[PDB]
């Protein structure tokens, strides 16, 4: 099905007059907000509420040091702000930042059984912050095992009679928790549907949030235009008609990985790769034959334009674009002297292709492997080790050691990959089946364990839940690499929720600005 979108993004000229206006006022609001953070004698609840709000407004990327030093101090002082609301929020904010605060802070809210006091069922703000906190738990937090089911049933009961915009904030949290949501997507919802309508809102912060979001959106629009032209200069809708034309969606994905302005070059490179590999996926799935695919897989392994002649004409266009894309990457990084790290992304792409081939081999043969074998292959075909490696290309700070760490398949990356795999398979267990795909994810699980379709999807969900707990542990200090390089992996898992349907998000993020 083609693109709802058209040439709607090919053209975009940033009215520099308006951009400079926004920037100038932002710089002022930025210092005002900074001073708010550096405020002396603030109660704990207030300081947490301030940090939470600046994060939800999507402007916390300006105060990384300030917010860190404040949470560090809160971590080390271990003061007991005894209410549920302040505790849960304190827990969440610290854990999201890597501080391993003990979960025994939730003991005072539980009876002799490790279960939450049913008497807290009437504290809505407390239930909400507990709910949000329940999604950042690791394997060592069994104390919170019932926190999610507890806060959920009561939030659902109380929701209908709450005042706005709290009613809306609660209904939305029950459909999408903050921790696992895409940053920009949650920021857009918070600013306009909640905070803007909040009676006690801080005008300086709302103004700041609206201006910043709109100004960065200008940058995203420029990037998407640049990328839309690049995509038309390839004429893949014309020279190679079988693939999906989802360059806007691919941009959304890159945008979900990181939205900050400093990751502009990074976002652009990443979109090109996501769009490129989407074609290779389309080739192996709905086009190429057993012989052609084998030639394609081999050509990719060699990685030399000379092998092009062994490939039929259509695959020649794909193959050349791919090699040229990586040549551009090498060229873009030539300046800093990081052109060289590009091979890491290439090695991951070859791996994706190998497993693509293996996947079609299993389909032809009618092979239903055991879950163990299925995953040893099906994990790379999610393309996540590949996109994750690609996301480091544009990050000027990425060193060789960061790529080295990533190539060893760290548990946090492994977890992110599993989430996409398991979610995709649960989502594609019935459709894929009628297209006669035999080595489906869940069938392998069904024939391997002796469980039904229901039990197999249920077991896959636990795999995803386990994976989230692993991602959360992966964030805890000391981190194997700087947090800057863990966030892209976390975001890749977030995008999964968000996707497993994109039109609304694209409109809210790339079409409509936030009306002031
Ligand atoms: C335009 C969009 C949605 C881009 C990002 C979405 C994405 C990561 C899709 C992966 C497709 C896969 C894994 C194909 C494999 O060849 P296989 O069919 O073997 O799983």
Curated annotation (Swiss-Prot):
Miscellaneous comment in the UniProt entry for this protein: PubMed:1438319 indicates the presence of at least two genes coding for the same protein.
Effect of residue 387 to I: Catalyzes the conversion of (2E,6E)-farnesyl diphosphate to (+)-5-epi-aristolochene and triggers self-alkyation of D-424 and Y-500 leading to enzyme inactivation
Motif window: DDXXD motif: 281-285
Cofactor binding comment, as recorded: Binds 3 Mg(2+) ions per subunit.
Listed SUPFAM superfamilies: Terpenoid cyclases/Protein prenyltransferases, Terpenoid synthases
InterPro entries in the cross-refs: Isoprenoid_synthase_dom_sf, Terpene_cyclase_plant_C1, Terpene_synth_N, Terpene_synth_N_sf, Terpene_synthase-like, Terpene_synthase_metal-bd, Terpenoid_cyclase/PrenylTrfase
Pathway assignment: Secondary metabolite biosynthesis; terpenoid biosynthesis
Name of this chain's protein: 5-epi-aristolochene synthase
Gene Ontology CC: cytoplasm
Domain notes: The Asp-Asp-Xaa-Xaa-Asp/Glu (DDXXD/E) motif is important for the catalytic activity, presumably through binding to Mg(2+).
Post-translational events: Self-alkylated at Tyr-500 in the presence of (2Z,6E)-farnesyl diphosphate ((Z,E)-FPP). Self-alkylated at Asp-424 at warm temperature (42 degrees Celsius) in the presence of (2E,6E)-farnesyl diphosphate ((E,E)-FPP).
Quaternary structure note: Monomer.
Gene this chain is encoded by: EAS3
Activity regulation (UniProt): Inhibited activity toward farnesyl diphosphate (FPP) by anilinogeranyl diphosphate (AGPP); AGPP undergoes a cyclization event leading to the formation of a novel macrocyclic paracyclophane alkaloid. Repressed by sesquilavandulyl diphosphate (SPP) via the induction of self-alkyation.
Effect annotated for changing residue 254 to T: Relaxed product specificity leading to equal amounts production of 5-epi-aristolochene, 4-epi-eremophilene and premnaspirodiene with cis,trans-farnesyl diphosphate as substrate
Residues annotated to bind Mg(2+) 3: 424-425, 428, 432
GO terms, biological process: diterpenoid biosynthetic process; sesquiterpene biosynthetic process
